[PDB]
A paper describes a structure:
Phosphate (Pi) starvation response (PHR) transcription factors play key roles in plant Pi homeostasis maintenance. They are negatively regulated by stand-alone SPX proteins, cellular receptors for inositol pyrophosphate (PP-InsP) nutrient messengers. Under Pi starvation, rice (Oryza sativa) PHR2 (OsPHR2) binds to a cis-element (P1BS) in the promoter of various PSI genes and up-regulates their transcription, thus optimizing rice Pi acquisition and utilisation. Our results reveal that the SPX2 senses PP-InsPs to inactivate PHR2 by establishing severe steric clashes with the PHR2 MYB domain, preventing DNA binding, and by disrupting oligomerisation of the PHR2 CC domain, attenuating promoter binding.
To reveal this underlying mechanism at molecular level, here we report the crystal structure of the rice SPX2/InsP6/PHR2 complex at 3.1 Å resolution, using InsP6 (phytic acid) as a commercially available surrogate for the bioactive PP-InsP. Based on this we expressed an engineered SPX21-202/∆47-59 construct fused to the C-terminus of the macro domain of human histone mH2A1.1181–366 for carrier-driven crystallization. In the complex structure, two InsP6 molecules bind to a SPX2 dimer, and two copies of PHR2 wrap around this dimer. In the SPX2/InsP6/PHR2 complex, the SPX2 dimer obtains a domain-swapped conformation, in which the N-terminal domain of one SPX2 protomer interacts with the C-terminal domain of the other SPX2 protomer, forming an intertwined dimer. Specifically, the domain swap involves helices α1 and α2 (NTD) from one protomer and helices α4 and α5 (CTD) from another protomer, which are bridged by two antiparallel extended helices α3 from these two protomers. In contrast, in our rice SPX2/InsP6/PHR2 complex, SPX2 adopts a domain-swapped dimer conformation and coordinates two InsP6 molecules in a 2:2 stoichiometry ratio. The helix α2 of one protomer and the helix α3 of another protomer form the basic binding surface for InsP6 / PP-InsPs. The binding surface in rice SPX2 is formed by the basic residues K26, K29 and R31 from protomer A, and K143, K146, K147 and K150 from protomer B of the SPX2 dimer. The MYB domain and CC domain of PHR2 mainly interacts with the helix α3 of protomer A, and helices α3 and α5 of the protomer B in the SPX2 dimer, respectively. Specifically, SPX2 blocks the assembly of PHR2CC oligomers by exposing hydrophobic residues normally contributing to the stabilization of the coiled-coil structure (including L340, I354 and L358 that correspond to the previously characterized L319, I333 and L337 in AtPHR1)26.
Author numbering:
A (entry chain A): 2 to 34, 67 to 190, 208 to 391
B (entry chain B): 6 to 34, 67 to 190, 208 to 391
C (entry chain D): 249 to 306, 330 to 365
D (entry chain C): 248 to 309, 330 to 370
E (entry chain E): 330 to 364
The structure:
Amino acid sequence: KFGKSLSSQIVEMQPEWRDNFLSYKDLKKRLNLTLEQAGFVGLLDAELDKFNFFFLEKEEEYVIKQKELRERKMASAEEVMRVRKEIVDLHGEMVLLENYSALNYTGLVKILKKYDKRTGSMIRLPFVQKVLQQPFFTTDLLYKLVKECEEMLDQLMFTVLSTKSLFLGQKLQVVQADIASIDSDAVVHPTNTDFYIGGEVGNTLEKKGGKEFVEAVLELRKKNGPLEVAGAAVSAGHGLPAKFVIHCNSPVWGADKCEELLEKTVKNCLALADDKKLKSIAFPSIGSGRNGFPKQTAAQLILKAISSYFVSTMSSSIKTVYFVLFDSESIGIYVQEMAKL
Amino acid sequence: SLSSQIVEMQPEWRDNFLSYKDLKKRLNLTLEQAGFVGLLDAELDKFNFFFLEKEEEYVIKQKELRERKMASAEEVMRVRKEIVDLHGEMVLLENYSALNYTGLVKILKKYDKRTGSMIRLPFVQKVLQQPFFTTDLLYKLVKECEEMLDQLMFTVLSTKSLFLGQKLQVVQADIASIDSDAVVHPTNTDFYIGGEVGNTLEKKGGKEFVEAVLELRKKNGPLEVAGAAVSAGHGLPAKFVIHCNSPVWGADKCEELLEKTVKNCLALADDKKLKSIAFPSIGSGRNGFPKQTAAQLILKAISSYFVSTMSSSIKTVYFVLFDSESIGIYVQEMAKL
Amino acid sequence: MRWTPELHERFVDAVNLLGGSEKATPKGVLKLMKADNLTIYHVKSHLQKYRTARYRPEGNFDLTEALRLQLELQKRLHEQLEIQRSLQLRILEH
Amino acid sequence: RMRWTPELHERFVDAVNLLGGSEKATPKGVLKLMKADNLTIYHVKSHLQKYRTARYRPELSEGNFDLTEALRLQLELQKRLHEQLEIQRSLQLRILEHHHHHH
Amino acid sequence: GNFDLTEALRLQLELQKRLHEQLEIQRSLQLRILE
Ligand SMILES: O=P(O)(O)O[C@H]1[C@H](OP(=O)(O)O)[C@@H](OP(=O)(O)O)[C@H](OP(=O)(O)O)[C@@H](OP(=O)(O)O)[C@@H]1OP(=O)(O)O
Ligand SMILES: O=P(O)(O)O[C@H]1[C@H](OP(=O)(O)O)[C@@H](OP(=O)(O)O)[C@H](OP(=O)(O)O)[C@@H](OP(=O)(O)O)[C@@H]1OP(=O)(O)O
């Protein structure tokens, strides 16, 4: 299917970039096929020459652009340094003017006292009252200007175990709590084809939820019948703080393409969560334990599937993904593999 | 005083303060009252004129600096955007070359299959000699671009903030390669360096680390149980290495001894005014301590130490762990902190 | 004479309206600012200062930290001057 | 010859600066200043063309959080693709070496 | 026969890498078109 993926990547590119990958009409010519085979190899050489020319042109352009942008980066850093230096200097000068005003006031009070003592009069108080009205004393504007300079310089210069802010814009939290009580929009329940409720997840959901929860599970099984492997279905979270419950049939370790089936299970759960326009989903320990998956393998596969799903679905409404874990080794493995996404 | 204050100032500030010449005038002296008051009013007018001139100048300068700063910010954003776009175009060219090479390989395989020939290998050898699909220089350009972008703007696994602002961080790295000020080395009474931490520390430090350990053993002698001693981090990114003798599980009051071990390591870190310290898995494993028990006791010791030591200079405490179960246990027990 | 950032903003706008920043006339700027009883002399001196000021002739983190320390010292000095002012006024109250 | 590299481009820009502004530099003088082997006036001159065109900046004479996050997302995607392409490079080299030494 | 098994594993890795790179270049062109 290499040709299909190649063409799907081409169609979304700029006209310059298209018609410079090798055409996949060479399969037709190949079919029509040592002299004419030598002509076919000459066609291959023509494709090589096309690649050479295009690549060399783009490479020269990129070299020039990178030297230019490095020069501009150095210039910009120098300019930012100069600007902040000048602003700090202006701040200091304003403070120095304040000190000038205060020091002159002090000396003036001193000389007024000396005058009142020399003559025996009492003019210091009214003279200072008049001095207070002088603009060299009204330093309110200096306070405002210093505050402005300082603001410019400031702008220029349920237990959660582990968090990971994904580069795509979502939050991956390994938490520890009763999954039935966690206020998540969706809660994933791994089950079998016949929708068993014997799971630990199923047990706590049956304890928290009422008879209406079991009735909703039964009605979901009535509507969809058997649940195929890697498939998933959605029921309403009746009697639960969760809005919806997403049941899934996780594959068994050792089956044909069981890892791809686990990835598909995770992706189907996420797709169903987006089908209900939900913003959060809670995943228990899936794959490991009952289904025989080793812990590290299942963790890395699930995290891979989540990341690739969110890569291929930019319109997704899911903002937070919870991982409800109790096994200490599983917690450590999930933290390790989650920090590497 | 006043003159000594005005010495270290620019010329326009000099001869603009209160001239003390009026003292002589005061010594010469209501007619002179009017004369003196007029001189004082002249000084006040001088003050006002100078102050208003400086204020106008400062307003002008602030306007100019604000506009200049906004211009520089626009230029920063433009340069950042353009470098990201160039990085993207270069990655697209790499993908171009890779896709074309893969298509060529597929076509060569199909040709060798249909025609019954064997030219895929020499044709690919020829392809290797072409100007495209020689992306060492392009890779270096992309790497330098990522460097510049990092400037323009070891893995931490979990972080817990204490009440007094200290950071407990479980990280995944080599404990010898961390740049923490102090690195704790669990050992015995004879400063044995054959432990796990011992071997990695020795790999990094070498002869200098071994000499530091030997000199510390000679200066300190036997390392008592729950004791600790500092050595210089010669040949190590760390500044110092705190060797400790963790107690053995099942010994008399081994819990209190482990608590005292951790607190003595922290006290030695504070004696040298260190800002960060790295802890490996202490007590658990070699000394028979179960993992969760040791992790909890160590975390309690750290917490109560920071409670009882208000003048502690330690800001960050690293936990370098390799076992996944140990990492999970420490994460869970920090959640309980 | 008492210039303020708001009046200076209005002044810069009026200068931008009256041709270029260098090819400007204080009388025209005054005609564009018929408020606060501004004079030709004061506006002319302010334009002279503005024209003379707008001319721009044509481990680093250690220096940046030294600059941060300078700013911090200046801020502390400003706060000390503020408490000085309040203290001196309270003395004048006796 | 026509393979312009960062070092050769640096030498070219240095020669241009020796002659003055790129707008007033002469390709013949640049060729005289560059002792690079097998360097023709055609290559020097076409490259001076591309350089002068790239150096022009017309933008000089004329929410931020969402924009910065979109830019950071783009950059992160590009970085991921680059490292994936490096891994693919390694795999291709291994497969080709094994097919060369084992047929 | 371990050599042939290694070669098959490397080919599988190559296909997986191709699919992932396709997804990523798709997302990048998407982000460009949306902005
Ligand atoms: O692009 P490919 O990787 O070569 O995939 C297939 C190839 O199957 P493979 O996945 O095993 O290589 C088909 O051959 P089969 O093994 O299924 O018989 C082949 O031919 P058919 O589907 O007609 O049998 C088909 O087309 P082509 O004849 O052009 O090589 C081609 O896929 P593409 O159409 O994308 O090349
Ligand atoms: O101006 P100061 O740096 O503060 O020091 C004093 C001043 O002290 P006070 O103003 O704080 O009281 C004297 O003031 P009086 O005695 O008039 O109150 C003053 O006058 P005297 O000469 O009568 O002591 C003397 O003046 P001078 O510099 O001429 O000595 C002067 O300076 P000194 O520190 O040298 O004493």
